[PDB]
Amino acid sequence: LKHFLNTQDWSRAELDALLTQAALFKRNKLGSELKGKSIALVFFNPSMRTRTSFELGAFQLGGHAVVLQPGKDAWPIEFNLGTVMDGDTEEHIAEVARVLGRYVDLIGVRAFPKFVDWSKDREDQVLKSFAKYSPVPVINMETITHPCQELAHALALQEHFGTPDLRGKKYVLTWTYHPKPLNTAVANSALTIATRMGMDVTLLCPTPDYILDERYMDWAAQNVAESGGSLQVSHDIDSAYAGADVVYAKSWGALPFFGNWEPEKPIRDQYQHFIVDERKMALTNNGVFSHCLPLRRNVKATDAVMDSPNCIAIDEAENRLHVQKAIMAALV
Amino acid sequence: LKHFLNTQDWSRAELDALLTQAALFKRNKLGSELKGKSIALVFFNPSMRTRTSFELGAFQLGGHAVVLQPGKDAWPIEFNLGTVMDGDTEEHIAEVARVLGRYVDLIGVRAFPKFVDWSKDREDQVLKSFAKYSPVPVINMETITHPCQELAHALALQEHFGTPDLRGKKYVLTWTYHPKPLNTAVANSALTIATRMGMDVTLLCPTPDYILDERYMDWAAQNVAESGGSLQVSHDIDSAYAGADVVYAKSWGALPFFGNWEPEKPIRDQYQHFIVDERKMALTNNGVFSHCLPLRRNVKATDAVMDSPNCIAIDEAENRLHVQKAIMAALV
Amino acid sequence: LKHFLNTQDWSRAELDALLTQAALFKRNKLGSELKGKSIALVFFNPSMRTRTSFELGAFQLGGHAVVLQPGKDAWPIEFNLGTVMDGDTEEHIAEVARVLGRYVDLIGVRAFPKFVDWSKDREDQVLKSFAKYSPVPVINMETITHPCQELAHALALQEHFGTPDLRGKKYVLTWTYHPKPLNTAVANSALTIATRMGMDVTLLCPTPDYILDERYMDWAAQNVAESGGSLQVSHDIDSAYAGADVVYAKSWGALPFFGNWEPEKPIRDQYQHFIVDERKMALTNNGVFSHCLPLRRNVKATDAVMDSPNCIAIDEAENRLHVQKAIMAALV
Ligand SMILES: CCC[C@H](NC(C)=O)C(=O)O
Ligand SMILES: CCC[C@H](NC(C)=O)C(=O)O
Ligand SMILES: CCC[C@H](NC(C)=O)C(=O)O
């Protein structure tokens, strides 16, 4: 059974095929690839673009999406095995996934980490459990990686540069400020796809404490050694931005401070200058800027940067619809 | 770009065309005016009729509605310009409207005032922001006016009297009781459409403090001088109801007490007799009664009045579906 | 006007026809029985299977389901007659049902008892009110009985035994543990359909305090005297399970302790051994086990029992989709 849990699990040929079908769907939006079929969109956290794009995608391909929110409308779910369910959870994922599998043709799941202990969050328990127990394909709508965002992002880049081959371009994945510590998911994904596409990647972040999990630093290393690109970690703003072709910002809490954010607060607060403004973007080679959204203006990026003709965030956002339809079509 | 923010922005010819198409859709409900198209229904407050009627309307015309609730499922939105987003809001309407505009063909928005300061609520910031930043038509699903309700109401009246020409009829817009101070939106809208239709309008309310915002009193004045009707403010029940052809009730907090409801509580509480009962309706010329709903029985109107054959509230409620389909068809 | 409030209200011929159409829909899922039609699914409590199955069912038959949650998105509703609505409820069911009746073709309603006073919960006020005021057919999505579950369950049994005639088989409806007192709805329904199908039924429960409401014990008595089966109440585990062909578990709070659960807590807590495990199921005649779900593993039933090839709960869950489509088709 083929799932869409991570682009890393797919071959470059399969990913290229997805992106191409995405471009094709962008040209002809209505189709019958999902006629009479349905997808259950399970959300354990908030969403605007993901819920909307998947729901419309199913509709445009002749299918139907059922939106579920455990703890809100659906019953809370237990994932640990062999435990006595006398707590807050009403049913086990074993039953949930099997039941849904009798109703729908695809299952999407969004579940952010709990931020109490990275040792447990990094195991990707919710996603793996759905994939384990579901008799139908499972799609990652963001857990500790955000693969649908990776493809929307990659397509937007290929569209901007007018070619599927991004090798050569200097890609800068920069950390940015936010009053709260966030998920590293989008950053892990950006690092993964940027290297898989063979670009010259630079992970710009405040201090070594903000370096991503080894799992992704290693995926990136293997991707580079096979794509022809390169990976580099930096803590100097100006040097990183210089000559860049692409700048992708994202904020995230330092992994070493999981379950202990009290001391990390003052640390991030002294790096508010990592905000993407005109000054930094001027150091790039007429490079493009993007963010996965939602974005806090004048915090993560300035109004000027967001309204700049070089900001392709809205195009990347649109592409979420096209890439997802390609993913659903490929899995059914 | 044409939007449906207020009937006042539309010409009488355009409004007559909408009402006619509404009547046509009421005769033939299934159509293809929205085939493959979609509308994002953004709700910042509760709704039963609006969400249901729009959702079914999109379905019946071959399209699909995506229901969103910022703060509930979708991310909270910021509307103020050039501010530092380090508060409760995650993204700016600038991005929200542009992203949705890449997904859907129409955007509906419902956003009640905050009731903290009428000076800010009356600016209609949420609605204006969507219309400003959206690349697709925007529809007012109720903010400080309720135009979809105006047309459902007008159509119901034309159906009751068997003619589109309502000139001559005596229309009474009466305030009614409610334990809490409410939005003036429906009252502002009733005053607007009743005069636009050229009826003899009387705004019956407890005291001068309950008179509506000058903006709408002025719209009404201009509507009368062009429709042939008339406007009048009254504080005497019996005289107002006498010979009336239509009685539309609605409760609302006195504008002069915005952000300071403590002292207004005892004021409204001494006017519970403004409730629409058999006695008052008997003073009318076999007139009809209606309310936008939801209605608190034995508080706003008595059970007898609600179950009276002269109460057309259910018909007006149904018309919300037909008028809205006419609006969506006209905007696409 | 025909509604689907309880299987008891339907003749055996009509129920047999529903089950047959259910089997037919299971063979050919896409149809046009609800083309252009819609159903309003009103939920006053949580749901995963019910919301999903009804929503997909409407879609597969060419219709559309509108999901509503009073108090969450829709306005709170009042059901008592002739009262002054100055409390938490915004509108009366009289208006709600009539308005929905102008929009949709069917109305489903789920409303659990309040658990404050069985004397009032047993009156089934919400369901009866919808059926009273709605101009369109009403469907019970679970209140104090769960008829859609009854048919999904019955069909699963007929499929397992390879015949619609279940007479002769020994059916055991056993109470099970749960940290909290639950609704008796599913148990009342199981007792009702098991006897209506003419099986040898045994209601196994801890003490006489856990016996179901007389209303259902009486329905069962009348069903037996007409179906040829038999009814029996038991408090001895091993004797009940011995030679059973079917074992259906469900937990519920003792009716005599409604509104006074404090003292019942220690009572249920001393019967945790009523859990359905391998030991008990081994006493059966290679019998099948099922539960309506959601189920707490290692509390209501053990992991071994749930993963046993004799557990048909997933099949019963799937059947909810098929039986419901048969119900909607029959009512339109
Ligand atoms: C697109 C994912 C956004 C989510 N953002 C927040 C602010 O929680 C995150 O950081 O993963
Ligand atoms: C149809 C709009 C109803 C809303 N009512 C309440 C009670 O908030 C209002 O007064 O504007
Ligand atoms: C299928 C109905 C399940 C509901 N369960 C809970 C746990 O509330 C009940 O006991 O009625």
Coordinates of N, CA, C and O in Angstrom, one line a residue, chain B residues 232-326:
Chain B
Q232 N -40.6 58.3 9.1 CA -41.1 58.9 10.4 C -40.6 58.1 11.6 O -40.6 56.9 11.6
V233 N -40.2 58.8 12.6 CA -39.7 58.2 13.9 C -40.8 58.4 14.9 O -41.4 59.4 15.0
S234 N -41.1 57.3 15.6 CA -42.2 57.3 16.6 C -41.8 56.6 17.9 O -41.0 55.7 17.9
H235 N -42.5 57.0 19.0 CA -42.3 56.5 20.3 C -43.6 56.0 20.9 O -43.7 55.6 22.1
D236 N -44.7 56.2 20.1 CA -46.0 55.8 20.6 C -46.5 54.5 19.8 O -46.7 54.6 18.6
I237 N -46.6 53.4 20.6 CA -47.0 52.1 20.0 C -48.3 52.2 19.2 O -48.3 52.1 18.0
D238 N -49.4 52.3 19.9 CA -50.7 52.3 19.2 C -50.9 53.2 18.0 O -51.5 52.7 17.0
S239 N -50.3 54.4 18.0 CA -50.4 55.2 16.8 C -49.6 54.7 15.6 O -50.1 54.7 14.5
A240 N -48.5 54.1 16.0 CA -47.6 53.5 14.9 C -48.3 52.3 14.2 O -48.3 52.2 13.0
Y241 N -48.8 51.3 15.0 CA -49.4 50.2 14.5 C -50.7 50.4 13.7 O -51.0 49.7 12.7
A242 N -51.5 51.4 14.1 CA -52.7 51.8 13.4 C -52.7 51.8 11.9 O -51.9 52.6 11.3
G243 N -53.4 50.9 11.3 CA -53.5 50.9 9.8 C -52.3 50.4 9.1 O -52.2 50.5 7.9
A244 N -51.3 49.8 9.8 CA -50.1 49.3 9.2 C -50.4 48.1 8.3 O -51.3 47.3 8.6
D245 N -49.6 47.9 7.3 CA -49.7 46.8 6.3 C -48.6 45.8 6.6 O -48.8 44.6 6.3
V246 N -47.5 46.3 7.2 CA -46.4 45.4 7.5 C -45.8 45.8 8.9 O -45.6 47.0 9.1
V247 N -45.5 44.8 9.7 CA -44.8 45.1 11.0 C -43.6 44.2 11.1 O -43.8 42.9 11.1
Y248 N -42.4 44.8 11.1 CA -41.2 44.0 11.2 C -40.5 44.4 12.5 O -40.1 45.6 12.8
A249 N -40.4 43.4 13.4 CA -39.7 43.7 14.7 C -38.3 43.2 14.8 O -37.9 42.3 14.0
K250 N -37.5 43.9 15.6 CA -36.1 43.6 15.8 C -35.6 44.4 17.0 O -36.0 45.5 17.3
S251 N -34.8 43.7 17.8 CA -34.2 44.3 19.0 C -32.8 44.7 18.8 O -32.1 44.1 18.0
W252 N -32.4 45.8 19.5 CA -31.0 46.3 19.3 C -30.7 47.2 20.4 O -31.5 47.9 21.0
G253 N -29.4 47.2 20.8 CA -28.9 48.1 21.9 C -28.8 49.5 21.4 O -28.5 49.8 20.3
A254 N -29.2 50.4 22.3 CA -29.1 51.9 22.0 C -27.6 52.3 21.7 O -26.8 52.1 22.5
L255 N -27.4 52.8 20.5 CA -26.1 53.2 20.1 C -25.3 54.1 21.1 O -24.1 54.0 21.3
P256 N -26.0 55.1 21.7 CA -25.4 55.9 22.7 C -24.8 55.2 23.9 O -24.0 55.8 24.7
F257 N -25.1 54.0 24.1 CA -24.6 53.2 25.2 C -23.6 52.1 24.9 O -23.4 51.2 25.6
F258 N -23.0 52.2 23.7 CA -22.0 51.2 23.3 C -20.8 51.3 24.2 O -20.2 52.3 24.5
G259 N -20.4 50.1 24.7 CA -19.2 50.0 25.5 C -19.6 50.4 27.0 O -18.7 50.4 27.8
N260 N -20.8 50.7 27.2 CA -21.4 51.1 28.5 C -22.8 50.6 28.6 O -23.7 51.4 28.7
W261 N -23.0 49.3 28.6 CA -24.3 48.7 28.7 C -24.9 48.6 30.1 O -26.1 48.4 30.2
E262 N -24.1 48.7 31.1 CA -24.6 48.6 32.5 C -25.8 49.5 32.7 O -26.8 49.0 33.1
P263 N -25.7 50.8 32.3 CA -26.9 51.7 32.5 C -28.0 51.5 31.5 O -29.2 51.9 31.8
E264 N -27.8 50.8 30.4 CA -28.8 50.6 29.4 C -29.7 49.4 29.8 O -30.9 49.4 29.4
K265 N -29.2 48.5 30.6 CA -30.0 47.4 31.0 C -31.3 47.8 31.6 O -32.4 47.3 31.2
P266 N -31.3 48.6 32.7 CA -32.6 49.1 33.3 C -33.5 49.8 32.3 O -34.7 49.9 32.5
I267 N -32.9 50.4 31.3 CA -33.7 51.2 30.3 C -34.5 50.3 29.4 O -35.7 50.5 29.2
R268 N -33.9 49.3 28.8 CA -34.6 48.4 28.0 C -35.6 47.6 28.8 O -36.8 47.4 28.3
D269 N -35.2 47.2 30.0 CA -36.1 46.4 30.9 C -37.4 47.0 31.2 O -38.3 46.4 31.6
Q270 N -37.5 48.4 31.0 CA -38.8 49.0 31.3 C -39.7 49.2 30.1 O -40.7 49.8 30.1
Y271 N -39.2 48.5 29.0 CA -40.0 48.6 27.7 C -40.3 47.2 27.2 O -40.3 47.0 26.0
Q272 N -40.4 46.2 28.1 CA -40.7 44.9 27.7 C -42.1 44.8 27.0 O -42.4 43.8 26.3
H273 N -42.9 45.8 27.2 CA -44.2 45.9 26.6 C -44.2 46.1 25.1 O -45.3 46.1 24.5
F274 N -43.0 46.4 24.6 CA -42.9 46.6 23.1 C -43.1 45.3 22.4 O -43.0 45.2 21.2
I275 N -43.3 44.2 23.2 CA -43.4 42.9 22.6 C -44.6 42.9 21.6 O -45.6 43.5 21.9
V276 N -44.4 42.2 20.5 CA -45.5 42.2 19.5 C -46.5 41.1 19.8 O -46.2 39.9 19.7
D277 N -47.7 41.5 20.2 CA -48.7 40.6 20.6 C -50.0 40.8 19.8 O -50.0 41.6 18.9
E278 N -51.0 40.0 20.1 CA -52.3 40.1 19.3 C -52.9 41.5 19.4 O -53.4 42.0 18.4
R279 N -52.8 42.1 20.5 CA -53.4 43.5 20.7 C -52.9 44.5 19.7 O -53.7 45.1 19.1
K280 N -51.6 44.6 19.6 CA -51.0 45.5 18.7 C -51.3 45.2 17.2 O -51.6 46.1 16.4
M281 N -51.1 43.9 16.9 CA -51.4 43.5 15.5 C -52.8 43.7 15.1 O -53.2 43.7 13.9
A282 N -53.7 43.8 16.1 CA -55.1 44.0 15.8 C -55.4 45.4 15.4 O -56.4 45.8 14.8
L283 N -54.4 46.3 15.7 CA -54.6 47.7 15.4 C -54.2 48.0 13.9 O -54.4 49.1 13.4
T284 N -53.6 47.0 13.3 CA -53.1 47.1 11.9 C -54.2 46.8 10.9 O -55.2 46.2 11.3
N285 N -54.0 47.1 9.6 CA -54.9 46.9 8.6 C -54.7 45.4 8.1 O -54.3 45.2 6.9
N286 N -55.0 44.5 8.9 CA -54.9 43.1 8.6 C -53.4 42.9 8.1 O -53.2 42.2 7.1
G287 N -52.5 43.6 8.7 CA -51.1 43.6 8.3 C -50.4 42.3 8.6 O -50.8 41.5 9.5
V288 N -49.2 42.1 8.0 CA -48.4 41.0 8.1 C -47.3 41.3 9.1 O -46.9 42.4 9.3
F289 N -46.8 40.2 9.8 CA -45.7 40.4 10.8 C -44.5 39.5 10.4 O -44.7 38.4 9.9
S290 N -43.3 39.9 10.7 CA -42.2 39.1 10.4 C -41.0 39.5 11.3 O -41.0 40.6 11.9
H291 N -40.0 38.6 11.4 CA -38.8 38.8 12.2 C -37.7 38.0 11.4 O -38.0 37.0 10.8
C292 N -36.5 38.5 11.5 CA -35.4 37.9 10.8 C -35.0 36.5 11.3 O -34.5 35.7 10.6
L293 N -35.4 36.3 12.6 CA -35.0 35.0 13.3 C -33.5 35.0 13.5 O -32.8 35.6 12.8
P294 N -33.0 34.4 14.6 CA -33.7 33.6 15.6 C -34.6 34.5 16.5 O -34.2 35.6 16.9
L295 N -35.8 34.0 16.9 CA -36.7 34.8 17.7 C -37.1 34.1 19.0 O -37.4 32.9 19.1
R296 N -37.0 34.8 20.1 CA -37.3 34.4 21.5 C -38.8 34.5 21.7 O -39.3 35.7 21.8
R297 N -39.5 33.4 21.7 CA -41.0 33.5 21.9 C -41.4 34.0 23.3 O -40.7 33.7 24.3
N298 N -42.5 34.8 23.3 CA -43.0 35.4 24.5 C -42.0 36.5 25.1 O -42.2 36.9 26.2
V299 N -41.1 36.9 24.3 CA -40.2 38.0 24.6 C -40.2 39.0 23.5 O -40.4 40.2 23.8
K300 N -40.0 38.6 22.3 CA -40.0 39.5 21.1 C -41.4 39.6 20.5 O -41.8 40.6 20.2
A301 N -42.0 38.4 20.5 CA -43.4 38.3 19.9 C -44.0 37.1 20.7 O -43.3 36.2 21.2
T302 N -45.3 37.2 20.8 CA -46.1 36.1 21.5 C -46.3 34.9 20.7 O -46.2 35.0 19.4
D303 N -46.6 33.8 21.3 CA -46.8 32.5 20.6 C -48.0 32.7 19.6 O -47.9 32.3 18.4
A304 N -49.0 33.4 20.0 CA -50.2 33.7 19.2 C -49.8 34.4 17.9 O -50.2 34.1 16.8
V305 N -48.9 35.4 18.0 CA -48.5 36.2 16.9 C -47.6 35.3 15.9 O -47.8 35.4 14.7
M306 N -46.7 34.6 16.5 CA -45.9 33.7 15.7 C -46.6 32.6 14.9 O -46.2 32.2 13.8
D307 N -47.7 32.1 15.5 CA -48.5 31.1 14.9 C -49.7 31.6 14.1 O -50.5 30.9 13.5
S308 N -49.7 33.0 14.0 CA -50.8 33.6 13.3 C -50.6 33.4 11.8 O -49.5 33.4 11.3
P309 N -51.7 33.4 11.0 CA -51.6 33.2 9.6 C -51.0 34.4 8.9 O -50.7 34.4 7.7
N310 N -50.9 35.5 9.7 CA -50.3 36.8 9.2 C -48.8 36.8 9.4 O -48.1 37.8 8.9
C311 N -48.2 35.9 10.1 CA -46.8 35.8 10.3 C -46.1 35.2 9.1 O -46.4 34.0 8.9
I312 N -45.3 35.9 8.4 CA -44.7 35.3 7.2 C -43.2 35.1 7.4 O -42.4 34.8 6.5
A313 N -42.7 35.1 8.7 CA -41.3 34.8 9.0 C -40.7 33.6 8.4 O -39.6 33.5 8.0
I314 N -41.5 32.5 8.3 CA -41.0 31.3 7.8 C -40.8 31.4 6.2 O -39.8 30.8 5.7
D315 N -41.7 32.2 5.6 CA -41.5 32.4 4.2 C -40.3 33.3 3.9 O -39.6 33.1 2.9
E316 N -40.1 34.3 4.7 CA -39.0 35.2 4.6 C -37.7 34.3 4.8 O -36.7 34.5 4.0
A317 N -37.7 33.5 5.8 CA -36.6 32.6 6.0 C -36.3 31.7 4.8 O -35.1 31.6 4.4
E318 N -37.3 31.2 4.2 CA -37.1 30.3 3.0 C -36.5 31.2 1.9 O -35.5 30.7 1.2
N319 N -37.0 32.4 1.7 CA -36.5 33.2 0.6 C -35.0 33.6 0.7 O -34.4 34.0 -0.3
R320 N -34.4 33.4 1.9 CA -33.0 33.6 2.0 C -32.2 32.8 1.0 O -31.2 33.2 0.4
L321 N -32.7 31.5 0.8 CA -32.1 30.6 -0.1 C -32.2 31.1 -1.6 O -31.2 31.1 -2.3
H322 N -33.4 31.5 -2.0 CA -33.6 32.0 -3.3 C -32.9 33.3 -3.7 O -32.3 33.4 -4.8
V323 N -32.9 34.3 -2.8 CA -32.3 35.5 -3.0 C -30.8 35.4 -3.1 O -30.1 36.1 -3.9
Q324 N -30.2 34.6 -2.3 CA -28.8 34.3 -2.2 C -28.3 33.7 -3.5 O -27.2 34.0 -4.0
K325 N -29.1 32.7 -4.0 CA -28.7 32.1 -5.2 C -28.6 33.1 -6.4 O -27.8 33.1 -7.2
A326 N -29.6 34.0 -6.4 CA -29.7 35.1 -7.4 C -28.4 36.0 -7.2 O -27.9 36.4 -8.2

